[PDB]
Design a protein around this ligand. Structure first.
Ligand SMILES: Nc1ncnc2c1ncn2[C@@H]1O[C@H](COP(=O)(O)OP(=O)(O)O)[C@@H](O)[C@H]1O
Ligand SMILES: [Zn+2]
Lengths: 536, 210, 506, 105
């Protein structure tokens, strides 16, 4: 109508799409939708930035699990949730993951259903209203500033049912699906990485049915919590085999075989007609797959391989190279780990778990962002529980920086209990989770102290409420006691202060920080006393 | 890094001659007491307290076999090659870690004063001194690089810790400039600088006080 | 007092030699602290790894009580624990069955990839009192497709295990506990004494097993001669509606008494009530912030409850870190009780326990507590543990720590103790001195601002110029008015001003 | 939850019944009935009375058991004194089963 035309010309994506659907100026409206999704710019750092960003802005939980009411504002780039009570932190990630299932389902299939809330586990046990709500608001550029979604469930036998409100999410996912069907576009990545990601690696890897080559396999089990590192290995070996092979040589060979078989049937051998028909079908299928691959505008296998290899080597510090070795009629993925060539099964658990996360994520991004020069600069939302899992302090100091550099447009929502990780993150990105005895909390607060670039000892005390020295060790109190004794005896080393000094010296050593501090105290107090005498 | 007062040549270096003899042959317990006199039980390059230690040839024995039993070339460095472990500053790093370097563009602390080339910031870093250009800058920058005087976290951490421990005493003394007269205050600063001869990382502590 | 010779004489013949063997194993004393101490201690003294995984050659001397192995990812901390566990499997197998076979090194994975001599060796030396000062065992494997196979040497392990097995068969003795707790602990018929060795060297410490076991023990211990019990059962049967529940309870007690009577001397066990009490005490003593644990059935479902930081909560209210640790301690206590029936305190038994990544899933708060009471509760266990936590290290003496150098390319021959004392030290110092990590992140620009600010002050004869003021304002804006960084900047300004004033007063 | 009232409609027209749900529900009922102290006191009072009658009848062997039960009763009374719907529900079902199923008493 004229109203839709005005709104569409004003930059409203839904109005433009509705006009496209009704008329199917049909080309004009299609182009407007496609440009809204695909337009972007390269910033001064050389990074591609979509003009219309996609991220989760707000989450509200009402009578969900232990929460009567909880509201969380999320950052566009990075949000980190901290606190003791890890069973509540994980509940937040679960709530988000269920909401994200609705976009995934509808990108894959028209009217696809996401995951629903459970009547048994998701409703707060003492809820007066006997229902639960998970409300999420997404942002998609200035044309679509609010995409609200609500997941709801009522208890059995309630007078009124509580239905989920999912239509906006479905409408948006429909735009992605329909526009992509006509002309390939880049698609958003959604993934959840729970503590489950730490699982033993099954070595024996399955024969290629060729599901792993399909673009939308990128959405398979994406919100399951472990990711599919097995799928990576299969896909990566597949990419390798295709790179070593020539493409359409099979078609050329099949073309030659069909031509030879056609000559035989023309020469009077009618018995081979059935075989000719089978081979013609195989040829047509090969061409169609090639054409569909051509039509899907997908990157060459060589390029895909290179992108992923670079990503892994950049993010995973111990890994300098990854490649496929062809031995014993069985393909093995090998890595150069700390200068030594090893199999994936020979990696330490820490290295393997982190490799698995990055590999999985990179695979999905490459598959979903074929039109970007760097597919890892695509859009998406990624949830990570306990990011420091298995990592040495040195890796903890780099992990967030590496991830954010490799995936610059992904919204990361993460949980941690590491001060070292927090030292690399701005306080605005931090949300503190301090619940009551009932588990209930209303808002999540940023810390008072700036964490980024702060000393870890300060974060421990000021953010995590942990002493720099272990309180249950006597020696931890000696310097404090020593200071008190010095102050009690007008700054002079008495017998008691001297004994303790000697104990500190004997225990910590002559060049210990503790002894130097004691020495400093002696010197300053002696100087204070000298001043006092001069004044008297 | 301190300016070191080399003075007397020990008797055992007279006997052994380059070409024929090797450093494996010479006794090391003969050489130490004069270096311990020179340096004061402290490392030549970083000013650690010496406990694990070795006799260091400033120009190495492989490249320069002429300067093998020469008293000017020898220094007491920290770290021990014999032990099964990785040491990453001073004598050991100059050989193994740093790799390629010009020997001429380094501060030899017996000959040259370090203080004109190096500055010790109280945040813990060693840097070139204020206003160096060309060749003197190159010596300062390479002494820092080749002895790994920042890049070792153990050294950097130990040095920062020490300086940061005394910075209450520094601030408190300079307040009392006002109320004391010059003879009282100059005696106090002499007395504090008297202490830090016996202390670890003395040049860094010096720059904090003065 | 050579134990092997005494045992050989026993086997060939006899009461005297048996008694000597039994006394060697069983004799001990109570120290001044009231703790039982075996006269003949059992521990792993030394480990050598040759061409094993990343190690060309590695030699480790272990502490009798606690050894903590630290290093970066991929330094081989887990490899070391695996090597020990496989060796210990040979003792366990032979305690259970004569000529039982332990585990073996993998020909695919456990040989170092660039070993010229394509075989691997794990050599361990155990100590068992002055009678048996050295028990050497070697596990060996040749790489796949090598013509020449290298044999493992396990007879000493078998010989020692045979002594435990045979002496136990005649007269019940206390037995050593061997257990490995790896990172997989976190993943989601009646009882008999040697079930304590079941899955001890992989699959131990699973929360669900504990809960099930604990509820079971509770039900049995809710609510004594056999002849007297038989008479009571007979009297109650004659009376039998209201007494039927009591009859069933008494019949159960009688059956249990007969079973205990019928049960063999080797499989002697403490009462279920005692077992329960010991495990409860162990949990409450060891686990941070748990003061009590008990089972409730009053809701109508079986619930394990705990008093956590003074609040009575369901065990499902515990963090995953606390659950996993509770599971580990409970499992260990359970095995110790089963294997040490003759001790007043069965937790004062002997054994070797391996724990990988002890801090797994623990908040910093609880990391500060976990090793305080492990050694107190289990005084005669040799603990060999791995950790990434400076907070954990702050509670441990440097003698117990074995560290890999950061630039270890797999050649180095010995693991050594850190130079600095860790126990009671600041975490910032442990990070820098022991773990080779800066206290501030070097990759963050703001981490260098104070350094840069100082340099600017020193360049402009101590006066706050336009450039220094801008940076000062940045520091103030970023870290805040109350920040330690700003206070340091202020301090620098004050000191430099005063230095410059002095310079003018030339 | 088996004790939720609308669990009565769970797989009600599936054809098998949910006999497993019955067993779980019945064990639940039992645990709750044992746990309330007054019924336990009443049950304990009845057990003490039965045991006292046996001791009065000349069976001196059960005197030790009577003393133990009297102590348990006193303790239960001392713990705070208080009809459970769960007890009645249990009884109704027991009666139904015994009345309808001939071999089960
Ligand atoms: N057969 C092998 N040859 C060479 N290196 C190996 C072999 N097996 C494992 N590694 C190496 O061993 C290290 C893993 O040791 P691991 O004990 O898992 O480390 P961590 O100390 O972090 O637990 C990695 O550096 C891996 O590359
Ligand atoms: Zn040095």
């Amino acid at each position: 109508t004229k109203q839709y035309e005005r709104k569409a010309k004003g930059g409203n994506l839904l109005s433009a799409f509705e006009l496209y659907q009704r008329n199917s100026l049909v080309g004009e409206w299609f182009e407007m939708c496609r440009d809204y999704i695909q337009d972007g710019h390269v910033d001064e750092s050389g990074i591609f930035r979509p003009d219309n960003a996609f991220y989760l802005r707000r989450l509200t939980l009402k009578d969900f699990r232990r929460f009567s009411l909880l509201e969380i504002k999320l950052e566009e780039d990075l949000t980190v949730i901290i606190g003791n009570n890890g069973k509540g932190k994980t509940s937040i990630l679960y709530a988000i993951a269920k909401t994200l299932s609705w976009f995934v389902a509808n990108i894959l299939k028209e009217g696809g259903s996401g995951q629903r809330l459970s009547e048994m586990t998701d409703i707060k046990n003492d809820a007066e209203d006997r229902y639960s709500d998970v409300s999420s608001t997404f942002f998609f550029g200035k044309g679509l500033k609010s995409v609200p979604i609500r997941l709801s469930r009522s208890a059995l036998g309630t007078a009124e049912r509580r239905d989920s409100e999912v239509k906006p999410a479905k409408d948006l996912a429909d735009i992605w699906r329909v526009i992509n069907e006509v002309n390939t576009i880049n698609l958003p990545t959604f993934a959840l990485y729970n503590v489950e990601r730490s699982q033993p690696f099954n070595r024996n890897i399955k024969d290629n049915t060729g599901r792993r080559e399909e673009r939308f396999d990128a959405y398979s089990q994406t919100l399951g919590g472990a990711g599919r590192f097995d799928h990576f290995v299969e896909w990566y070996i597949y990419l390798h085999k295709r790179t070593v092979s020539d493409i359409s040589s099979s078609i050329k060979e099949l073309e030659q075989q069909v031509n030879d078989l056609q000559r035989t049937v023309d020469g009077g051998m009618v018995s081979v007609k059935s075989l000719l028909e089978q081979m013609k079908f195989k040829l047509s299928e090969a061409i169609e797959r090639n054409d569909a691959a051509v039509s899907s505008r997908v990157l060459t296998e060589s390029v895909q391989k290179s992108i992923v290899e670079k990503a892994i080597c950049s993010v995973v510090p111990s890994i300098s190279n990854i490649w496929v070795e062809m031995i014993t009629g069985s393909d093995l993925v090998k890595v150069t780990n700390d200068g030594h060539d090893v199999t994936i099964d020979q990696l330490s658990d820490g290295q393997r778990v982190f490799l698995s996360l990055v590999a999985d994520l990179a695979r999905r991004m490459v598959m979903l962002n074929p039109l970007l020069e760097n597919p890892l600069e695509g859009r998406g939302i990624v949830l990570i529980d306990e990011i420091e899992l298995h990592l040495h302090p040195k890796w903890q100091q780099e992990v967030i920086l590496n991830l954010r550099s490799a995936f610059p447009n992904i919204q990361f929502i993460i949980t941690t209990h590491s001060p070292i990780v927090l030292s690399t993150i701005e306080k605005r990105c931090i949300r503190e989770f301090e619940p009551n005895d009932d588990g209930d909390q209303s808002f999540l607060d940023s810390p008072d102290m700036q964490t980024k670039g702060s000393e870890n000892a300060q974060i421990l005390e000021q953010v995590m409420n942990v002493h720099s020295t272990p309180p249950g060790i006597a020696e931890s109190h000696w310097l404090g006691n020593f200071e008190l004794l010095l102050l009690d005896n007008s700054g002079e080393l008495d017998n008691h202060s001297q004994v303790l000094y000697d104990q500190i010296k004997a225990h910590f050593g002559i060049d210990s920080i503790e002894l130097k501090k004691a020495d400093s105290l002696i010197r300053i107090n002696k100087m204070k006393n000298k001043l006092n005498k001069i004044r008297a | 890094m301190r300016e070191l007062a080399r003075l007397e040549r020990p008797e055992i270096l007279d006997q052994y001659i380059a070409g024929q003899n090797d450093w494996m042959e010479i006794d090391q317990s003969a050489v130490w007491p004069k270096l311990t006199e020179m340096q004061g039980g402290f490392c030549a390059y970083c000013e650690c307290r010496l406990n694990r230690c070795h006799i260091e040839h400033f120009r190495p024995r492989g490249k320069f076999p002429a300067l093998t039993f020469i008293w000017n070339n020898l220094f007491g460095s920290c770290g021990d090659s014999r032990k099964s472990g990785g040491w990453s500053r001073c004598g050991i790093y100059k050989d193994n870690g740093a790799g390629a370097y010009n020997a001429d563009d380094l501060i030899k602390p017996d000959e040259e004063n370090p203080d004109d080339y190096l500055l010790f910031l109280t945040t813990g870093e060693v840097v070139p001194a204020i206003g160096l250009t060309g060749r003197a800058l190159k010596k300062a920058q390479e002494t820092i690089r080749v002895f790994n005087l920042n890049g070792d976290i153990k050294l950097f951490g130990s040095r920062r810790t020490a300086v940061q421990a005394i910075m209450p005493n520094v601030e408190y003394l300079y307040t009392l400039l006002e109320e004391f007269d010059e003879d009282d205050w100059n005696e106090m600063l002499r007395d504090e600088l008297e202490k830090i001869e016996s202390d670890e990382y003395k040049t860094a502590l010096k720059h904090a006080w003065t």
